Amino acid sequence: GEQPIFTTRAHVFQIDPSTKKNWVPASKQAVTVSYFYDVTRNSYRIISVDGAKVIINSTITPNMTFTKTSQKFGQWADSRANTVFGLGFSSELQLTKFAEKFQEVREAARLARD
């Protein structure tokens, strides 16, 4: 009931809630990050898992934005989890492809709820 849409690998970070200025690593090494379409819920999600620890389970809505802050790093806010996720990539192209997929998914999310 869940189809993978796009898969990449990145280092995952979350912004420190107190200072809002520091990145806390949410994974020791790089982890798999995937976009999924949830056929049961008619929604798109970003899912990253490190064994039995679910690091990212972000449902993507049209309002959410992925902001690139370097050639290899970008971030998006997830109000449901009350956090900001950052992803660090080993090549600039992986960041670009992730950002482009993110924008694609935002419109799919809005078109899917029409």
């Binding site: 990145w23 802050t69 370097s70 790093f73 009350n82």
Partner: peptide
């Protein structure tokens, strides 16, 4: 709020060079 008045710097490993 989760809003940023200023965007945060990326982690030092993933920053763009400056110079």
């Amino acid at each position: 709020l989760l809003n940023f008045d200023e965007l945060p710097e990326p982690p030092a490993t993933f920053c763009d060079p400056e110079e």
